[PDB]
Symmetry: C5
Subunit: 346 residues, 5 copies
């Protein structure tokens, strides 16, 4: 006899003086709530909004001496979420929620079991859209650090303390991959204790290091910006002194270079500073604009101008072509060395 749901209504009901509005160990030491999470889903990391969506299993463990049964033979008593509002629960929240919700499909997704000595496991499923500030100084090569922090709202430090457990405080699902990022295995765990004019409130947080996948931006933004500089080096071969087509190749490789420089920031926040994709576009814009300034310098030296003088201004307008045909694969190559050593090391 003695089923658990009838027995546990005796443990927390009208008799035995249990009050769900009062924390355990009242007028004594604070409640030590230890926590760990299990990340089911991760991603949709937007940058116009600067937020990310996570789907976690928030597990909470504390001790409640009023729920310590002694004569019931089992070791754990589950509690379905119909009677979930009948015991004490910590008032945990996230300091960067930006909208969140539970999951209530076919049953309230809430887990609650009570051990013999009073250890209470409390596991719920939460979908969060957490805010993290994006630092985009070196944009295709940055390592973002987006955090999540777990505060108390109504209980101060002298009544309720949050801790991480030592046995794997952040678990990650097995095949959890990201379309644009990779989640590094080392996850920092530190304190974030807040001081308001109301009091000091407990806080624990977990950093997540997000490294980008450079392989996408190496296809769309780097190679067509490297192919268009080779396209601007075709103008050094067309008719070798003067043409109406070297102007047509000098203009047109600045046009789509301006479009690709403007199209590279189509889905980005309007940040105040210069980033890594800017000084790849705004330096390769010089290598396609100096190729048209050269033909403007050739067509002014060649068409300026006797017998002796004919040997002068023709050998001077050919010296501009056959030297800058090789000098631009030296200036563009010495920048391409300097660009990647600056950013791949950082």
């Amino acid at each position: 006899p003695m089923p658990p749901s009838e027995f546990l209504d005796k443990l927390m009901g009208k008799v035995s003086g249990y009050d769900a509005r009062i924390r355990p160990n009242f007028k004594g030491p604070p409640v030590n709530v230890t926590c760990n999470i299990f990340i089911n889903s991760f991603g949709s990391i937007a940058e116009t909004t600067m937020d990310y969506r996570v789907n976690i299993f928030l597990r909470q463990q504390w001790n409640d001496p009023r729920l310590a049964y002694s004569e019931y033979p089992d070791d754990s008593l589950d509690l379905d979420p119909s009677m979930l509002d009948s015991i004490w629960k910590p008032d945990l929240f996230f300091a960067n929620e930006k909208g969140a919700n539970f999951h209530e499909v076919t049953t309230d997704n809430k887990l609650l079991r009570i051990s013999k000595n009073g250890n209470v496991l409390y596991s719920i499923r939460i979908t969060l859209v957490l805010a993290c500030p994006m630092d985009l100084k070196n944009f295709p090569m940055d390592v973002q650090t987006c955090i999540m922090q777990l505060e108390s709202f109504g209980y101060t430090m002298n009544d309720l303390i949050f801790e991480w457990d030592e046995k794997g405080a952040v678990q990650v699902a097995d095949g959890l991959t990201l379309p644009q990022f990779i989640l590094k295995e080392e996850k920092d765990l530190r304190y974030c204790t807040k001081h308001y004019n109301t009091g000091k409130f407990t806080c624990i947080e977990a950093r997540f290091h997000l490294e980008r996948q450079m392989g996408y931006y190496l296809i769309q933004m780097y190679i067509p910006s490297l192919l268009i500089v080779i396209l601007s080096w075709v103008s050094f071969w067309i008719n070798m002194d003067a043409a109406p087509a070297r102007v047509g190749l000098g203009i047109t490789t600045v046009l789509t270079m301006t479009t690709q420089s403007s199209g590279s920031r189509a889905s980005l926040p309007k940040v105040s500073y210069v980033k890594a994709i800017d000084i790849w576009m705004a330096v390769c814009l010089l290598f396609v604009f100096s190729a048209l300034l050269e033909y403007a310098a050739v067509n002014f030296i060649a068409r300026q101008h006797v017998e002796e003088m004919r040997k002068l201004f023709i050998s001077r307008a050919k010296r501009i072509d056959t030297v800058s045909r090789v000098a631009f694969p030296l200036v563009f190559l010495i920048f391409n060395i300097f660009y990647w050593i600056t950013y791949k090391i950082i």
Copy 2:
């Protein structure tokens, strides 16, 4: 006399000791819940978010010996959703919900009938937005496998086991078509039993094989990329040695080829690897860029340069034109053989 709604309140009410917070066969064998789904709607398969929306009829069948009436003459007793929170129900959920809801139009869309021996049918309507990781290595020719899995949240393996029924575990509606995909008839059914630090929980899943319709990408992305290579072969005929228009056709078929290569990935996730639509664009980019590098080689050989020597540099700059007029329909044709046999077989 004895109406069912008054009779069944005797079966589960205050008398007879029925408690909806306690599973059937308590302190005994686990509850064997068998399930099958009926897909009403399918689709809106996004790839930026990597998710799909489904609209199912979730049927659940278990046995409850406390609900086994004997003296009532009927074989089945329906139960409207007003008294739905009064019997035991399995706490099923989806491990990749990503937000979901019920349907509550004109009545809570819930079905519940109880047989004589205790068999309980439970059919509800759920709209899900399920997550599936997209593998886009061969993008217009891939066969996606998007899954859905049905776990328990509060009952472990020794208390509740999920199964698929043998009589058509996944039904599909009659005229259910997809705008971009086709749903294959063979649907895999296997186990996905999860191990956490709380316990081990039951899980059953059903795979759906989604094959794309290549007919859309054969019109927008393949034929204008095949027409623009024919457009670049017009330059082998214009004035046959030298023109200011062969540059104008050499530049311009790289411009919109760059735009079509960039516009082909307008609604795609920023994946790290190269896909099948990339190495169709980034190889046909060579066939429109080598056609301009040829005229840069023709205009350097023809305009380089006597009586005997005049026969040399004219017959040499015409040999470049009349051979590569036929060689490029050999190189582009030998790639076009190699590109489709690689991907249509896989």
Copy 3:
């Protein structure tokens, strides 16, 4: 004396044995619920999602012999939605809901009146986002047929039957117009009785024939595609044998023709088959691409090439121009006859 709300609480309350969980005519003939709708709003007919939004007044009429009062002098008793969950209601739903909601502004928008013999009128306001598969074979000239179907969820055919009433089963508001479509006056009304593994369930449906307004696509997509073919016929007049500008007009009218062919499908689903707007773009793409292949054929015949021989290759390269200047207004006109007779008849 005897107010209705006090009298009707006697009619359905604890006394007289009324039970809102039991259908009328129990253990007898099925309940014949007759229905008609009033479409307030219609439209926002998307095609990427293939759905439409409607705003209806759902009226339901059935008979309930337990509500047949006799001695109260009035003919009808209204029932405000505070006591709405106290009588029986049919569990109607829509088989293609895709999310829906009620309207609860300043009062629950629900109407309920009870006649003397037991006739119960029940009118509620529902906003639906209904799904309909789009058939886009002849896209600017198609007649779409989007339906809505009204099923029962928990009551089978032997307990509850849906019917349309004979007195105008679908009413439409007076000034209801659509931005892209016109709603035809003939609305089909037929049965859609579903067979599941649970039972057979009643279903009635209403077809809505949606004919497009071709006047939008006649301005944006047809006239600039007809103007660009006239633009390609300008090249037959420029210098009459050879120019570096006939190449520039031959290239450029393929460029924006490719963009307009790609821009015409900017807000469309990725369907597997070819549609009517495709073979207007992909045939007028030939009339702007054959005009450049002609000048490539002229510049190869003119620049190929004596005294007698001079009369040959000049009269042959002029014969190509002065015949195809008139032949292309014959080939483009004989397609334009064949294109519209195929689609305006269907």
Copy 4:
């Protein structure tokens, strides 16, 4: 003594026979509910959906003789929204809701006070997304008339009548401006009484005349369409008889004119008819396309062609240039007079 909340529970509670399900003046004259609104926010007037969002204070005043206290000394008794569902309220709704909601921040935003003679003031805050059909025949110069109508849902004309009050039936906030429109001060107030097959229901409505701000469309769409016609008049000066650049200026001013004609309708509904911005684009498309047909006519007359005959065809191909250089500032100016007098008067 005698606080209001204890006194008013006597006025509407179990004693005195008050029933909130029964309208005042029952079996008598209908209830005359007078209404006025206060528009806090207005705007976000979309045209793809053809709707606008408003944020109003809906005030309702009626008479309830059962709430007419006599011996309590005050003149008004406020009623907080905790007891809001305990007296009678009219079932007002909007016939063009398209989704709406209340505001429940820190308290249900509901006001309710009861005078001595029975006058009841009832003020709530509603956010509406109201539908209005857009008439876009003269699109940048139209005066839109978007309405809002307030019906009853359960009470017919012989039980409940809506009226506007004479003392400012529509108030507008002080600094309420709009980004694209201006709200005219004259607001029409008329009746909209509906007839259904259920009965006839009361309805009152208020028209809002919305005049556009033409200053935006005068910058983006009119001046670059007027600058590009001046750009097409540059071709009458370049080399004065024949050039390969007059073709290049003739083609290119049709290209971006086609893009600006297509880009002007980027965020507009797909209406069946022609509008005012169309016949500014589709007439200035002629003035940039006839300028290229002129050079095609010049290059056919000049290059057609003796001593006497040389004076003929040179003075004939120059007569085309020097007359149409001045005739096009006469034809484009006589249309520009005719265009604005047609639309600014209407």
Copy 5:
């Protein structure tokens, strides 16, 4: 003994005559509620909608003499949100809500503590989407002032007065940064007392001065608009009297200048007036269009035209080139001085 939750149910329950529907100091002086906020998150400041999203901690302090306990030994009694609807609360709302919500993750995020003398602290977490009208006369250099105002809804001025506290009435989080703006430290605090036809209602508000970051618009919109003017100055060097390429550089630098002038207002509201980014685009449009009107003036003077007369029309068409090659770096530089002194001072 005497736990707080049992003691406080005596303080506000059935005994002691406490009524939560009645404000403190009834029939006396008004309730002086003092407020201060803590901005957690700020931003997503849209301009098409003209709104911003804030995430605040709304603290409210007032005095309630009915809650002034005397014999309980503690100084403050917390109150969890399960009993939150049992005492009096001010009916605060925001006059520009535009939709808002609470936060209910793992507990209702509400704080409530009661001191000994009756001081009641009440702190809740609210997410707001507040409306502010944008003034965009000088668009990249403006200082926006977006406000938030806190009114009462049901209590007039003679019953409830809102105030700001003197001890830091608006606190901001530590590392709160914005992607496009910076939040100035001086925050104005003034009154906004409203007068309706119902009464006069209290209101307090806080101004937030938002200054833009000009560094984004200095990269995308200013440098490619300054590079294209240098690109138009290349045409003064190409062949120095006449070319078919100076037309090709005169047309093309107007094309993308028109696109950049249209693309700069891609995500902006359709305002009626001219802004700062307009008269940078619409003046640099003149410097790229007058460079083509010069070559049309050169090609008409040079190609107009003896021995003496040959020296006239060649020295006249070269005087146009060599003077306007230096005059345009004087006119564009004297505007660039006048443009920034006008706007950076304001």
